[PDB]
Design a protein around this nucleic acid. Sequence first.
RNA 1: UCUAGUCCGACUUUGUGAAAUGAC
Lengths: 100, 147, 99, 203
Amino acid sequence: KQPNTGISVGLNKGHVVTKKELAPRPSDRKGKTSKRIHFVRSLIREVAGFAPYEKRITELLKVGKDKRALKVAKRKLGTHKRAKKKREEMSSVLRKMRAT
Amino acid sequence: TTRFKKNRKKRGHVSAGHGRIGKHRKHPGGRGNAGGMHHHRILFDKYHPGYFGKVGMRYFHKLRNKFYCPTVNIDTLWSLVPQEVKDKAAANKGTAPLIDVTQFGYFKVLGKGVLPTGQPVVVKAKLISKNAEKKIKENGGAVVLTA
Amino acid sequence: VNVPKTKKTYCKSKECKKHTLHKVTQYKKGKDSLAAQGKRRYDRKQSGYGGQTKPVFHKKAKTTKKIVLRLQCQGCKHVSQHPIKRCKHFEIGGDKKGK
Amino acid sequence: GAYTYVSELWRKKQSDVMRFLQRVRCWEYRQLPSIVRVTRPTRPDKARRLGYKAKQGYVVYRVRVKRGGRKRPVSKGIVYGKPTNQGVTQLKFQRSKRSVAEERAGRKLGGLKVLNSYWINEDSTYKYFEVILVDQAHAAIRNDPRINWICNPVHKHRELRGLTSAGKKYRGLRGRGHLHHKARPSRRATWKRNQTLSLRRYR
RNA sequence: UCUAGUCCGACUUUGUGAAAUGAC
Ligand SMILES: [K+]
Ligand SMILES: [K+]
Ligand SMILES: [K+]
Ligand SMILES: [K+]
Ligand SMILES: [Mg+2]
Ligand SMILES: [Mg+2]
Ligand SMILES: [Mg+2]
Ligand SMILES: [Mg+2]
Ligand SMILES: [Mg+2]
Ligand SMILES: [Mg+2]
Ligand SMILES: [Mg+2]
Ligand SMILES: [Mg+2]
Ligand SMILES: [Zn+2]
């Protein structure tokens, strides 16, 4: 994201102007919660447990069927982006569970 | 204007100019563009070649502002300079006027025609054709690019 | 109709631009893809209610097809297509007359 | 601050704790009529974020609605028309089950104003919602600046004009820009505006 | 070219067990 070259074509084209960083906004921390919210969600996970399909994912990760675990996650959740995020969450749960 | 309408001249002539045999019926050849391939085939092929069929690539949500590029030719470049500035151009040959076509709502400079004789001009534009640049240079001028 | 297995014909490839040896094989129409835009539109049009939404040809008249020879150049390994006249019996590399 | 715990627990609907509680509640609701007054919301945390307040004038009703599509209500499944319109099943109502629950409560409770509603349970045959209604005539409501707007005549039968939260969803108003632009100010208003033939004086 | 109905399968309603057999 270099300053514009002043030419109408090519890389970094555009009118020459002094660029500046946008002023910080409260919405910049969207997607971040307080420490209490993380504490509450962690506690409820202990009380509630895991869903049946999440149990299926972790069972596949124990036998090392990582590829099949992701396909199950995508079929359930729907998107590849959410599926691979869910698989990493199950791996993290299993990773620190086998170490206890 | 009703009094000039030719139907008035046809009052008392029975058929109103549409004939006794053929008559004036409702839609004896179909409505609008009906039968373009069947009974109006000759008309379409003779007067509208290329009407039927598909050509080229689609462009979903095509915005015309992205393609905005008004052009000005070499022969019209001198007319942009104010008359009072034209006299100054002929009064001092050491300097040359700077014609920024963008200030007059033009992006690209094309090369149709010729420049005034013995008058160098510095042309400022976003884009320029090779012939336009050659004609500007051979007249003693220069080209500057902007955006 | 009998056609030889090999044929020496002109090659349009910029590498050759000359007469070269070609291997003769018969063209066969490939499988229709489900992802082709025309198929995608047809499936959308056919969905829901309304029944058959496109014509279905029924009055077949031709008893033959225009066989297309697939000529693969042996130099540049490129293919050219050469249709022949209609025929009911066609083969490539069959026994020549007399022999 | 206890509502976050309750709300997060209700996000785990497939857990053993919730599956048990929902299973028992689903049986209980089936035995009762399709519209029932409840002494207090089953989901206080969910209710108060939709505008519910624990004060006189606010009432909660549970509404039961049948599930599935909309069979075309035509005798013997016979349609007199072209094949494109001959479908009878696999047709879907343009309004949602949540909207239907609000309309059922609104029509029955003509003396109250529908504020909002929320999902509480479902089975294969029925879907259950709780509808929050306001007694606009109660003094506690009329003296409350945050809710007394609903006492004005323009807000009569919000649910029957598609003006509730569920109403905005099925009208296409939850969203804007290139994907929702035809829904504002209304779908039929957009059509009439675009169909208008403007014949100016000097044309 | 379609359709009510009807037959059929899957998912859902739908939980608690056991055995046989099979897969990972
Ligand atoms: K006439
Ligand atoms: K259709
Ligand atoms: K009809
Ligand atoms: K039609
Ligand atoms: Mg006459
Ligand atoms: Mg007549
Ligand atoms: Mg005629
Ligand atoms: Mg006419
Ligand atoms: Mg569809
Ligand atoms: Mg269908
Ligand atoms: Mg009370
Ligand atoms: Mg507009
Ligand atoms: Zn070749």
